[model samples]
Target chain A: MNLEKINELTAQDMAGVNAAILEQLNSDVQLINQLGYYIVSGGGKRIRPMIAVLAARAVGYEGNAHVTIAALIEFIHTATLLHDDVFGNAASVLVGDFIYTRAFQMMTSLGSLKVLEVMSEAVNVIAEGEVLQLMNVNDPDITEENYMRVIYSKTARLFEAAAQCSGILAGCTPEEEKGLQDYGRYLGTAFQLIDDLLLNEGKPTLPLRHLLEPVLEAMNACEWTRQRAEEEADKAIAALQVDTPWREALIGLAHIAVQ
Target chain B: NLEKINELTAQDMAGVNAAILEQLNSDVQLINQLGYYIVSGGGKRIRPMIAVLAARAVGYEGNAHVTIAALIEFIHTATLLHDDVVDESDMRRGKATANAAFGNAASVLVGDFIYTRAFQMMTSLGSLKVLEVMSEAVNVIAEGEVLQLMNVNITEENYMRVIYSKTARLFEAAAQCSGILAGCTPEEEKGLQDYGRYLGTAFQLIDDLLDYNNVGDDLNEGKPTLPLLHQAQMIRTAIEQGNGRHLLEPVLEAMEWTRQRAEEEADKAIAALQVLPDTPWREALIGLAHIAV
Candidate 1:
């Protein structure tokens, strides 16, 4: 599968990303170190870091900065998962904050103002989306449009920022930057929809279920959502521009998103 | 003396308050609505004032102190939001908490929004050193909080460590970073750090001690306070036996001991300020410690 190929291609950098995640998470606080390992070692796909690495490589920038950004992207994702975790609310809420602020500390390390702006907007929008989804729970009056908005804000926006920052670090031109940005949004929107379908049917329930179940019952027939994901994967493939196998790997990831 | 310090710091605090409001503006209506409720909810801005006074006393003539003061309070407010939800508190400072008025979820997320915005503001300063200090201060606050939750302990030394992490660390950073930005001599910076740390330690000591009364009762909640721990044998049995119906009178005497220790910390804070010139800001720092007493 392309997921395997993509993983092999980005394997070195993902190691760097993972190492950074572990190193940065270690601190004087023993509880944080233990919990940090527990959270980071979960069997996440690490696809966000993969896209970050592939985006940089495809752009032909040869540097280790991508590794740091890639780690940070995953850190942000992990923090969101931490916030949304069903563990003790206090543990989830506080440790998630430690992870969140630690990611900001890493962003400061990069010394890039634009990246900070992008990541700051990413975190703010993600938080806003979460609160919006929280507010919408138990309300049957939600529309299809609002569901799409929630998914884009909470999930896709981080994906958008991850790819966009990779472009910035690679010294991308304006049009090329937009292409990467659009590609991420399209792919991520697809991923969110498919994830909901899987969760709605097979994998899960209430926090996410309470939020997505009603919308799926009325708005999302399986074929309809699959078609929507198909269109996005197509857009992401068209959006990518590169001659390297790295580009192919990205395109592979887009396919993998829907498959 | 309290009124004098408030009046003296009025103009500087005006800018700090204004910056706090402006930074909280957001596209999300819930964020703005609840951010307003907590930041403007009636509590004195001691941490921000400590920052403002320390910067002025350190002889920094820059607008960035206003930025530092504001972001300092943002961390404080964010901690408060999460603290309420952790404790399941229905009220704070005589008002319904953000968690109480909105919900636990709102407080956690907006608490998050506020802290991230503080980072956003700090990055704009372009000083990695400030970023380093402030970020660690906040992280320590979380650890302190986690430490507090994990700890249902009774050692005086352990109690000191928890309070330092939870409260004194922010106060310490506020003063230390102010001197850092100003490029003050290291000796002066050390004094400011000491001043802030001891002041905060004194403030927290009195706070935990005051828990004997309904501001509110730490005992009723079975929280182990220094007042309760003062007479280890008596208080230990009272706790072991539970309900604590007859524990009040002796513990009130124990609070008298706690108050004296608070004043000793206040005096230490004043002693730390001896390096500064005799400006009103410097004196106001001394005044704050005395007020803490």
Candidate 2:
């Protein structure tokens, strides 16, 4: 029910996943090593891979493919972070590239064209979402619909891929895959909603409009959005059919998102 | 000679162009506009040319190679868009750069779009070998870019390394992937790769020479190209006299050094092709090398 509990539950799996991440981050280039190590070790929660590992295990997966896939999911996320920050222009950009291609290399190593195809498409969508976010930065006319699309593409798509690929590697039915994907999508959206809430000092900017005294109205809108996110989190837990301690942990993970 | 090569690859280039335009199609209006503008500008499609020639030299008759060639051009253009933003340049290929037309933020994000889109294209080929070669090549290219950044205002010892990374590596990948697609032997792949590497080196060397001759904005902007380093005395003397033309004789002398080096590279590139069976495609590859000087 807490970070320590989740760590204890997933400790062994996460250790393997983290080791794989570190191994993939290796490059003969010193700059790549320094920057890659810095960013990967830079206090990320590893929550995305946790979703992957938990989802795979909850579905009765006993193979090791999920470990590599989970690490790859983290690499994709890390690559985006490397590009997201603006400092150390060339260093950040190129190191971001090193991580990106390195992820591709690892993706190929998984030997699943389906996983490769799906994850590559996810990256493209994430990039498109990034461009959409850049376009929406100063615009006050952003609709609730537009904002949800951005978050889903930017934040939730990878989560969807992570869980969905786990289902595939676990040999799940299409229906089960859809269920896991929905769970990931909902949970990821909840995660981003909380992130925006914290970033905007609890007055998140969903449903942004050109209202008079927009900041005050945005505060009320933030409360509404927060309530909506809680509803989605509950739905995320409801989407899963598997009943296990891991499933309980997933619910706990969602609860933690809105805490 | 360039025209002849272009003529020989005219229809293939058309396919490459179409694939490029098709790939640039996106629901995002800014991405479409910027991608189209950059791809359709007056830039010579040399990377695609190398890919097309390498494919044919190995007797590849399918259309997949065309897509691969276009994808190579896309990767090159993606780097150019990002490079322009990073270097804060106003012009490229004799036109306003994407960063100049679009903002830096747009340029960077769209560069990300093109890069990821290229990956999507690479996946469509369904060849793990192509993916492996290209993925490694792209990582090396990134390292090369960072090396170039670190070597800013440094000596020529690192300059060639930068050129190999920033320019020639993609050329090597383009040809190598063509070989893979054609199902060529390892020796043939090596031959094509060597050809691309040496030709790409010569091509970059010629570009540096152009900088010295005042042919482009590189010299005026004080880029630390090889010719500029070699002709430092001539440049300083010409600047003291307040006569740009006074630098020409020495500039030509320095350009000749670059030309000779380029010629040597061209010879090496041609020598690598000796193992290939004599075909016009092979000769075209050789001709492309000679044209690099």
Candidate 3:
């Protein structure tokens, strides 16, 4: 399969992901379904799951488990998004916010013990990471190591799990399995590093934007600004194994991520 | 069977209870504080212990019961958190409810944590059947709680639905998991499953009895229970003949319908339990029933 073609192919696949998410979020519970739609419809790349499916194909997974894993990973990612948003502004008590509750109510799907465990554990770890990150927030002492740890716990986990999810189904083992994990991890790091840079650099915000731009800056610039940047690029490269076709693009992804 | 199991199984069952408590520990101080406040507040380790004993009664030797046991307890804890919030309850089992001690937001978030945490524990067990059963159980339980919220002061039909959900389903699941763990024959499994259903039904009936008899916390809230059993029949009569709506609205409004009314309901609850056995499980259940009254 062509890597360039796959990257370009994100839209149709993403639409499918978007639509699947919308359909699943549909429930008799009004707030649950409504909030599910709001989050799914809200803007963000569905890249985590997109990579899941891609990794599955690259590794030659021939079954539908890949699809199921992809969907489940997306659900898990969505669950984190809902909970994370609530956590991000935890000081704000926007009562009647449906996002968190709706995501949970929607999670009644995936009914497997293993899937539920991984998802919940992922949630628990994410919570831990958020707290750790919060402690570092705005502290200039925030190290690249700590930031990488936070990103791994928060972002790369979903990526790694999405790929492992396929591996479990594909029955891949040892080094091959680790490779998929490395791929997902590097991809996720590059992706997040890009996000941090975009938020930190440039105009930083449209002045007309009511979007708490300064606060966002304060969050990133809160710690060691320069070290954090170097570390972001360093981590993006480090999470990868050498000589894979994805490696060069991943490096490119990191450069683009921060530039 | 209940007698044989109790004589041989009670201590082993107690071991599960201790394990359940042991498992509640958190490296974090506040989490442990919050968990202990709820899990250790005598909320009832019976459900988890029951799951354990049932596993033994069915003759399984392995310790997988611990997982199911913990899971069942966690589900119950989560339910209590959500319940107190909706009912606005300040106390349970003679102590401050979690929501009362902590604020609603923390209680709610922690409740979410337990619910997901329970599922995480369930996942470690790695049984598809177990997962399927548990997922459905949690969903139904949630639906039941939500449905009960809708039924708070509605018609008899709605009330019946609430009983099936908030009380009986948990009872049913506890015994059913016991049966599953013990590797019982299909017929035996069926028997144990039905046993939980009837036992749970008896349990809740007694709770309703306590409400009517002015036995438990319902008195503070002026909640209705079994004594209202016979009195409830009079509601439509009062509504039709004496404008009970006007008269009853005060009772409902006061949130303390009167102990005299509660006594009537508690008796009805005992009357309902008489349909079950006279075995040890049934007997201990009966004693517990009195608490509700």
Candidate 4:
């Protein structure tokens, strides 16, 4: 019954969001048709919009995270966007553009100028962070502070934006809104902190390959990173504003996020 | 007329350059470093000049065109960054490319920094029209970049379409933004669109001609230019088989044929200017077209 209840609000609303998404994806141009359609409709659950709705509901909290993809979808494209060798530099560059500009088309439809400001600034920082990370790739003295900064910009910035945008849409107190934003950012930072380790073993060419062996391999590399992730989750749980069962669900969600 | 054009628009062009410098500043050090390396690095400022002149000649009274001019160049510079990476270029105009200096990853990411930065510049204009024009221009440019990559052999139709998109669309957007900002009458706006469309087509055609006349790197890079389409089979063998460096002299055999085509295109740009005021600034526009010819 509980799963059914949550699914009820989610399914109907996401169908609406997905239909909006499908409409947004249409293009008369063939290459956009072939490339953009190949990616946007590539078999993901459109999970961000689902979270936007759930997060909004979790807070009592919101409306229209119509720009959910601004955070999530743009981050997905970063994989192909920055890594030149993974795809042809030409297609990597071009395909990234189609995805990026198409995200703009989605934002303008929301028509809230402040939200638009939030997104454009977020995107600029994301790009800026990508470049900073590019520069750090070769530095032998790569440090945790620099690594954390890049992680926030390239990955967690979108997560922060996704949460804050929902807050803006949903009509919360400035305090509630700020709490949600911090929660989103902290939760996202924690997930990536954990993710840094998960990706370490069996993953080659990670940025922290340098930082790992000396400070990390000696004792608590796994435990140390895990501890940091849990700390971020604690920060996130405290950052939630309201005292409802829905709030409890979010706190639990952050716990799962860290794991 | 070239001297007159420079004499007339000097202050506004300075403002345009200032705005260009201002926008290139960023919290990120490499963006600040590389942005200066390219924006101040130098090219003939054709796109920015046309933007400034289009507004001035239209009798615009505001500073928005300076912003327009700056962002137009931003679009151009951003493309230069990525184009170098995609082409695996080491140098641009006798200097090392950003991709060569900073690496391809920096080129791609910083290319994105400048590209998205231009959008921030576009949004500052508070005109949805800028958004619409730029959103379309960058998309066409992305598509154009890909279509060029899909080629080792191409037709004249293919060549014309790619140049129109990759080269001309930004020019068209540059001019059209000036007109849109000026609030020129719809009839005048249509004329501005045609003027840029023709002017940019002529500019790119002449560029292809110059490359073929020079006929060294493009053939070495194995990319097709317009002259090659005249003797498509020989070009095909160069692309398909390789080491037809000897074929370049014979290819110059094709170049003597079509100096008139681009000249004719420049005249079309000149004719399109008739809808704007017949002021001296407009005459400078014609003079620019003639120079392209």
Worst 10 residues of 2 chain B by lDDT: B238-247
Select the stronger candidate by lDDT from 2 and 4: 2
> Recovered native contacts in candidate 1, as a fraction?
0.48
Task: After the best TM-score superposition of candidate 1, give how far the Cα of residue B224 lies from its true spot, in angstroms.
Answer: 4.0
Write down the lDDT that model 3 would get: 0.54
lDDT of 4 by residue, A101-144 (tens): 66776666565566566767777877888777666654556544
- Candidate 4 lDDT tens digits, B223-293: 66665556356777776653456555666553344457778778987887898888877888789898876
Over B58-87, each residue of candidate 3 has an lDDT whose tens digit, in order, gives: 556788886788878887887787666665
Regions of candidate 4 where Cα sits further than 4 Å from its true position: A1-49, A53-72, A75-88, A138-146, A167-177, A199-222, A242-252, B151-162, B221-224, B238-246, B254-257
What stretches of model 1 exceed 4 Å from their correct place?
Answer: A27-31, A37-39, A61-63, A86-88, A140-146, A170-176, A199-222, B154-162, B214-217, B220-223, B231-234, B237-255
User: What does candidate 2's lDDT look like per residue over B155-248, in tens digits?
Assistant: 5557676666656888888998998998999999999888878788888888777664415445444455566555257565433433344333
Q: How much is B76 displaced in model 2, in angstroms?
A: 0.6
lDDT of 3 by residue, A1-259 (tens): 3445546654544556556666655655554456556655556545566666655655556554455556556666654554444312321111121223333333334444444555557655554444445344444433434466767766777776676555555666567667666756665655554455423422221111223223434332222433455465666456445254334544444454445
- Give, for candidate 3 chain A, the lowest lDDT window spanning 10 residues: A201-210
Which model is ahead, 1 or 2, in terms of DockQ? Answer: 2
Docking class of 1: acceptable
Candidate 4 CAPRI category: acceptable
| lDDT, candidate 4, at B90 | 80
Model 3: TM-score, first chain: 0.63
Q: How well is candidate 4 docked (DockQ)?
A: 0.46
Ranking by TM-score: 1, 2, 4, 3
Worst lDDT run of 10 residues, candidate 4 chain B, spans B250-259
* DockQ each: 0.49, 0.49, 0.20, 0.46
